[PDB]
Protein backbone atom coordinates (compact mmCIF):
# COMPACT_ATOMS: atom_id res chain seq x y z
CA UNK A 1 0.00 0.00 0.00
CA UNK A 2 2.02 2.97 1.29
CA UNK A 3 5.74 2.97 2.18
CA UNK A 4 5.57 5.72 4.80
CA UNK A 5 5.54 3.55 7.90
CA UNK A 6 3.37 6.09 9.68
CA UNK A 7 0.76 5.83 6.93
CA UNK A 8 1.14 2.08 6.37
CA UNK A 9 0.65 1.77 10.12
CA UNK A 10 -2.19 4.17 10.89
CA UNK A 11 -4.46 2.20 8.58
CA UNK A 12 -4.23 -0.61 11.13
CA UNK A 13 -4.89 1.04 14.54
CA UNK A 14 -7.68 3.53 13.78
CA UNK A 15 -11.41 3.84 13.43
CA UNK A 16 -13.06 5.88 10.70
CA UNK A 17 -14.00 9.50 11.47
CA UNK A 18 -14.09 8.96 15.22
CA UNK A 19 -13.27 11.61 17.82
CA UNK A 20 -9.55 11.21 17.14
CA UNK A 21 -9.99 14.19 14.82
CA UNK A 22 -12.22 16.20 17.13
CA UNK A 23 -12.50 19.26 14.91
CA UNK A 24 -14.21 17.47 12.02
CA UNK A 25 -16.75 15.80 14.30
CA UNK A 26 -17.53 19.05 16.09
CA UNK A 27 -17.94 20.79 12.74
CA UNK A 28 -20.28 18.11 11.44
CA UNK A 29 -22.44 17.85 14.55
CA UNK A 30 -23.49 21.47 14.75
CA UNK A 31 -24.08 22.55 11.16
CA UNK A 32 -20.72 23.67 9.92
CA UNK A 33 -20.06 21.06 7.22
CA UNK A 34 -21.22 22.24 3.80
CA UNK A 35 -21.01 18.95 1.89
CA UNK A 36 -24.19 17.60 3.46
CA UNK A 37 -25.61 19.77 6.25
CA UNK A 38 -28.48 18.62 8.50
CA UNK A 39 -27.16 15.06 8.35
CA UNK A 40 -26.56 14.87 12.10
CA UNK A 41 -29.74 16.74 13.00
CA UNK A 42 -31.79 13.73 11.85
CA UNK A 43 -30.15 10.65 13.35
CA UNK A 44 -31.64 8.59 16.08
CA UNK A 45 -31.47 9.85 19.55
CA UNK A 46 -29.05 7.53 20.92
CA UNK A 47 -26.56 8.06 18.40
CA UNK A 48 -26.85 11.68 18.59
CA UNK A 49 -26.49 11.84 22.24
CA UNK A 50 -23.57 9.58 22.25
CA UNK A 51 -21.60 11.53 19.91
CA UNK A 52 -22.35 14.68 21.77
CA UNK A 53 -21.34 13.06 25.05
CA UNK A 54 -18.10 11.96 23.40
CA UNK A 55 -17.54 15.43 21.97
CA UNK A 56 -17.88 17.59 25.08
CA UNK A 57 -15.75 15.30 27.24
CA UNK A 58 -13.22 13.39 25.10
CA UNK A 59 -12.10 9.95 26.19
CA UNK A 60 -8.39 9.37 26.68
CA UNK A 61 -6.60 6.73 24.62
CA UNK A 62 -3.47 4.64 25.03
CA UNK A 63 -1.17 5.11 22.00
CA UNK A 64 1.49 2.55 22.98
CA UNK A 65 0.27 -0.07 20.52
CA UNK A 66 0.18 2.43 17.67
CA UNK A 67 3.79 3.54 18.12
CA UNK A 68 5.12 0.03 18.66
CA UNK A 69 3.31 -1.20 15.56
CA UNK A 70 4.67 1.74 13.58
CA UNK A 71 8.26 0.91 14.44
CA UNK A 72 7.66 -2.80 13.82
CA UNK A 73 6.21 -2.07 10.39
CA UNK A 74 9.17 0.18 9.66
CA UNK A 75 11.51 -2.69 10.47
CA UNK A 76 9.51 -5.02 8.25
CA UNK A 77 9.52 -2.70 5.23
CA UNK A 78 13.26 -2.15 5.71
CA UNK A 79 14.25 -5.85 5.67
CA UNK A 80 15.20 -5.86 9.33
CA UNK A 81 13.10 -9.01 9.87
CA UNK A 82 10.86 -11.42 7.99
CA UNK A 83 7.09 -10.86 8.20
CA UNK A 84 6.62 -13.88 10.47
CA UNK A 85 9.41 -12.42 12.57
CA UNK A 86 7.39 -9.20 12.40
CA UNK A 87 4.38 -10.84 14.01
CA UNK A 88 6.63 -12.25 16.72
CA UNK A 89 8.71 -9.13 17.31
CA UNK A 90 5.62 -6.95 17.72
CA UNK A 91 4.66 -8.90 20.84
CA UNK A 92 8.29 -9.03 21.92
CA UNK A 93 8.65 -5.25 21.83
CA UNK A 94 5.24 -4.81 23.43
CA UNK A 95 6.28 -6.90 26.43
CA UNK A 96 9.61 -5.08 26.60
CA UNK A 97 7.90 -1.69 26.78
CA UNK A 98 5.18 -2.88 29.16
CA UNK A 99 7.69 -4.15 31.71
CA UNK A 100 9.82 -0.97 31.70
CA UNK A 101 7.30 1.74 30.86
CA UNK A 102 7.73 5.39 31.82
CA UNK A 103 7.02 8.81 30.39
CA UNK A 104 10.62 8.93 29.22
CA UNK A 105 10.05 5.65 27.38
CA UNK A 106 7.04 7.10 25.55
CA UNK A 107 9.06 10.17 24.59
CA UNK A 108 11.88 8.02 23.23
CA UNK A 109 9.28 5.95 21.38
CA UNK A 110 7.90 9.00 19.60
CA UNK A 111 11.45 10.02 18.75
CA UNK A 112 12.00 6.52 17.41
CA UNK A 113 8.92 6.44 15.19
CA UNK A 114 10.04 9.72 13.67
CA UNK A 115 13.53 8.33 13.15
CA UNK A 116 12.35 5.11 11.52
CA UNK A 117 9.97 6.98 9.22
CA UNK A 118 12.87 9.12 8.05
CA UNK A 119 15.08 6.04 7.78
CA UNK A 120 12.68 4.19 5.50
CA UNK A 121 12.27 7.21 3.25
CA UNK A 122 16.04 7.71 3.06
CA UNK A 123 16.68 4.05 2.30
CA UNK A 124 14.19 4.07 -0.56
CA UNK A 125 15.51 7.25 -2.14
CA UNK A 126 19.11 6.08 -1.74
CA UNK A 127 18.29 2.74 -3.36
CA UNK A 128 16.82 4.69 -6.26
CA UNK A 129 19.70 7.20 -6.27
CA UNK A 130 22.74 5.14 -7.29
CA UNK A 131 23.88 2.73 -4.55
CA UNK A 132 27.03 4.34 -3.14
CA UNK A 133 28.25 0.89 -2.10
CA UNK A 134 28.94 -0.03 -5.71
CA UNK A 135 30.84 3.24 -6.14
CA UNK A 136 32.98 2.46 -3.09
CA UNK A 137 33.75 -1.03 -4.38
CA UNK A 138 34.67 0.33 -7.80
CA UNK A 139 36.99 2.93 -6.30
CA UNK A 140 38.69 0.23 -4.24
CA UNK A 141 39.18 -1.88 -7.36
CA UNK A 142 40.54 1.07 -9.33
CA UNK A 143 42.99 1.73 -6.52
CA UNK A 144 44.06 -1.89 -6.91
CA UNK A 145 44.59 -1.34 -10.64
CA UNK A 146 47.63 0.68 -11.74
CA UNK A 147 47.02 4.17 -13.05
CA UNK A 148 49.92 4.24 -15.55
CA UNK A 149 49.87 2.67 -19.03
CA UNK A 150 53.19 2.81 -20.95
CA UNK A 151 51.48 2.76 -24.36
CA UNK A 152 48.85 5.48 -24.40
CA UNK A 153 47.38 7.16 -21.33
CA UNK A 154 44.62 9.57 -22.40
CA UNK A 155 42.45 6.75 -23.73
CA UNK A 156 43.01 4.71 -20.57
CA UNK A 157 41.99 7.42 -18.12
CA UNK A 158 39.14 8.51 -20.39
CA UNK A 159 37.85 4.93 -20.33
CA UNK A 160 38.25 4.77 -16.55
CA UNK A 161 36.17 7.92 -16.14
CA UNK A 162 33.63 6.47 -18.57
CA UNK A 163 33.31 3.32 -16.45
CA UNK A 164 32.95 5.43 -13.31
CA UNK A 165 30.17 7.41 -14.98
CA UNK A 166 28.44 4.23 -16.14
CA UNK A 167 28.34 2.66 -12.69
CA UNK A 168 27.18 5.95 -11.18
CA UNK A 169 24.47 6.81 -13.71
CA UNK A 170 22.56 3.50 -13.70
CA UNK A 171 21.24 2.42 -10.29
CA UNK A 172 20.44 -1.24 -9.57
CA UNK A 173 23.87 -2.09 -11.03
CA UNK A 174 26.12 -4.09 -8.73
CA UNK A 175 29.89 -3.82 -8.24
CA UNK A 176 31.50 -6.10 -5.69
CA UNK A 177 34.23 -8.63 -4.98
CA UNK A 178 33.53 -12.35 -4.55
CA UNK A 179 36.90 -14.03 -4.98
CA UNK A 180 40.24 -12.40 -5.66
CA UNK A 181 38.52 -10.41 -8.42
CA UNK A 182 36.03 -7.59 -8.90
CA UNK A 183 32.88 -7.97 -10.99
CA UNK A 184 30.08 -5.87 -12.44
CA UNK A 185 26.49 -7.12 -12.74
CA UNK A 186 24.16 -4.91 -14.72
CA UNK A 187 21.26 -5.79 -12.42
CA UNK A 188 20.35 -7.84 -9.39
CA UNK A 189 19.11 -11.23 -10.59
CA UNK A 190 20.50 -10.23 -13.96
CA UNK A 191 22.75 -11.76 -16.59
CA UNK A 192 25.77 -10.02 -18.16
CA UNK A 193 28.34 -10.36 -15.39
CA UNK A 194 31.74 -8.99 -16.38
CA UNK A 195 34.96 -10.19 -14.73
CA UNK A 196 36.30 -6.69 -14.20
CA UNK A 197 39.78 -7.71 -13.06
CA UNK A 198 40.28 -10.12 -15.96
CA UNK A 199 38.87 -7.58 -18.41
CA UNK A 200 41.29 -4.90 -17.25
CA UNK A 201 44.21 -7.34 -17.27
CA UNK A 202 43.44 -8.31 -20.86
CA UNK A 203 42.82 -4.71 -21.95
CA UNK A 204 46.03 -3.36 -20.40
CA UNK A 205 47.99 -4.43 -23.46
CA UNK A 206 45.66 -2.93 -26.08
CA UNK A 207 45.41 0.74 -25.10
CA UNK A 208 47.94 2.79 -27.04
CA UNK A 209 49.14 0.43 -29.78
CA UNK A 210 45.97 -0.96 -31.34
CA UNK A 211 45.26 2.23 -33.28
CA UNK A 212 47.63 1.45 -36.20
CA UNK A 213 46.70 -2.25 -36.15
CA UNK A 214 42.92 -1.80 -36.26
CA UNK A 215 42.82 -2.31 -40.02
CA UNK A 216 44.18 -5.89 -39.91
CA UNK A 217 42.50 -8.65 -37.90
CA UNK A 218 45.88 -10.04 -36.85
CA UNK A 219 45.57 -9.16 -33.15
CA UNK A 220 41.77 -9.16 -33.02
CA UNK A 221 41.84 -12.53 -31.25
CA UNK A 222 43.64 -10.95 -28.29
CA UNK A 223 40.29 -9.53 -27.15
CA UNK A 224 38.75 -12.06 -24.83
CA UNK A 225 34.94 -12.19 -25.10
CA UNK A 226 34.49 -11.07 -21.49
CA UNK A 227 36.27 -7.82 -22.32
CA UNK A 228 34.12 -7.62 -25.44
CA UNK A 229 31.02 -7.65 -23.25
CA UNK A 230 32.65 -5.07 -20.98
CA UNK A 231 33.14 -2.77 -23.97
CA UNK A 232 29.60 -3.46 -25.20
CA UNK A 233 28.14 -2.36 -21.86
CA UNK A 234 29.87 1.03 -22.19
CA UNK A 235 28.71 1.80 -25.74
CA UNK A 236 26.06 4.36 -24.65
CA UNK A 237 28.72 6.02 -22.51
CA UNK A 238 32.10 7.23 -23.82
CA UNK A 239 30.60 9.18 -26.71
CA UNK A 240 32.50 10.06 -29.88
CA UNK A 241 35.89 11.67 -29.34
CA UNK A 242 36.28 10.47 -25.75
CA UNK A 243 38.31 7.50 -26.97
CA UNK A 244 40.67 8.39 -29.81
CA UNK A 245 39.23 7.07 -33.05
CA UNK A 246 40.99 4.90 -35.63
CA UNK A 247 41.82 2.58 -32.72
CA UNK A 248 40.59 -1.00 -32.51
CA UNK A 249 39.06 -0.23 -29.12
CA UNK A 250 37.77 3.07 -30.48
CA UNK A 251 36.44 1.40 -33.61
CA UNK A 252 34.53 -1.18 -31.57
CA UNK A 253 33.15 1.49 -29.26
CA UNK A 254 31.99 3.61 -32.18
CA UNK A 255 30.32 0.67 -33.92
CA UNK A 256 28.53 -0.40 -30.75
CA UNK A 257 27.47 3.17 -29.98
CA UNK A 258 26.03 3.62 -33.46
CA UNK A 259 24.15 0.32 -33.23
CA UNK A 260 22.57 0.92 -29.88
CA UNK A 261 21.64 4.36 -31.02
CA UNK A 262 19.58 3.43 -34.02
CA UNK A 263 17.79 1.02 -31.91
CA UNK A 264 16.47 3.02 -29.01
CA UNK A 265 15.55 5.75 -31.34
CA UNK A 266 13.55 3.54 -33.59
CA UNK A 267 11.99 1.96 -30.60
CA UNK A 268 10.60 5.08 -28.94
CA UNK A 269 9.15 5.71 -32.38
CA UNK A 270 7.31 2.38 -32.30
CA UNK A 271 4.14 2.42 -34.40
Amino acid sequence: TDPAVRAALQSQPSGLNSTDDWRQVMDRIMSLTARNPDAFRQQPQANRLSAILEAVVPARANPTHEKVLAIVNALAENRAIRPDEAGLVYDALLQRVARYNSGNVQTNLDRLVGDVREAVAQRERAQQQGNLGSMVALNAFLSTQPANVPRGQEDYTNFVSALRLMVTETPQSEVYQSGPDYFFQTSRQGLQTVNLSQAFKNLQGLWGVRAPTGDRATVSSLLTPNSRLLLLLIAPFTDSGSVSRDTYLGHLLTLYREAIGQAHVDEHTFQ
Binding site: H65, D91, L94, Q95, A98
Partner: protein, 49 residues
Amino acid sequence: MTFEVDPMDEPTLLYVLFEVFDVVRVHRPHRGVIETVYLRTPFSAGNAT
Protein backbone atom coordinates in the same frame (compact mmCIF):
# COMPACT_ATOMS: atom_id res chain seq x y z
CA MET B 1 -47.18 -7.01 36.24
CA THR B 2 -50.31 -9.09 36.77
CA PHE B 3 -50.87 -12.38 34.95
CA GLU B 4 -54.10 -14.38 35.03
CA VAL B 5 -54.00 -18.04 34.05
CA ASP B 6 -56.21 -21.11 34.09
CA PRO B 7 -56.13 -23.40 37.13
CA MET B 8 -53.96 -26.50 37.24
CA ASP B 9 -53.62 -29.15 39.92
CA GLU B 10 -49.81 -29.09 40.11
CA PRO B 11 -47.33 -26.33 40.95
CA THR B 12 -46.22 -24.26 37.98
CA LEU B 13 -43.81 -21.41 37.40
CA LEU B 14 -44.26 -18.45 35.09
CA TYR B 15 -41.23 -17.60 33.21
CA VAL B 16 -40.80 -14.11 32.08
CA LEU B 17 -37.86 -13.53 30.01
CA PHE B 18 -37.25 -9.93 30.29
CA GLU B 19 -35.46 -9.14 27.19
CA VAL B 20 -32.38 -7.17 27.59
CA PHE B 21 -29.03 -6.20 26.10
CA ASP B 22 -26.07 -8.46 26.88
CA VAL B 23 -22.75 -8.00 25.07
CA VAL B 24 -19.11 -8.88 25.67
CA ARG B 25 -16.07 -7.04 24.33
CA VAL B 26 -12.93 -9.17 24.06
CA HIS B 27 -9.62 -7.39 24.61
CA ARG B 28 -6.40 -9.27 23.82
CA PRO B 29 -3.44 -6.90 24.05
CA HIS B 30 -0.45 -9.24 24.34
CA ARG B 31 0.25 -12.87 23.54
CA GLY B 32 -1.72 -15.16 25.82
CA VAL B 33 -3.75 -12.46 27.57
CA ILE B 34 -7.54 -12.19 27.39
CA GLU B 35 -9.58 -9.39 28.93
CA THR B 36 -13.36 -9.32 28.71
CA VAL B 37 -15.67 -6.39 29.40
CA TYR B 38 -19.17 -7.67 30.13
CA LEU B 39 -22.41 -5.71 30.17
CA ARG B 40 -26.12 -6.39 30.70
CA THR B 41 -28.04 -3.15 30.98
CA PRO B 42 -31.67 -3.66 32.12
CA PHE B 43 -30.40 -5.99 34.85
CA SER B 44 -27.06 -4.38 35.56
CA ALA B 45 -24.10 -6.76 35.76
CA GLY B 46 -20.54 -6.66 34.50
CA ASN B 47 -17.50 -4.43 34.53
CA ALA B 48 -18.08 -1.24 32.54
CA THR B 49 -20.39 1.58 33.59
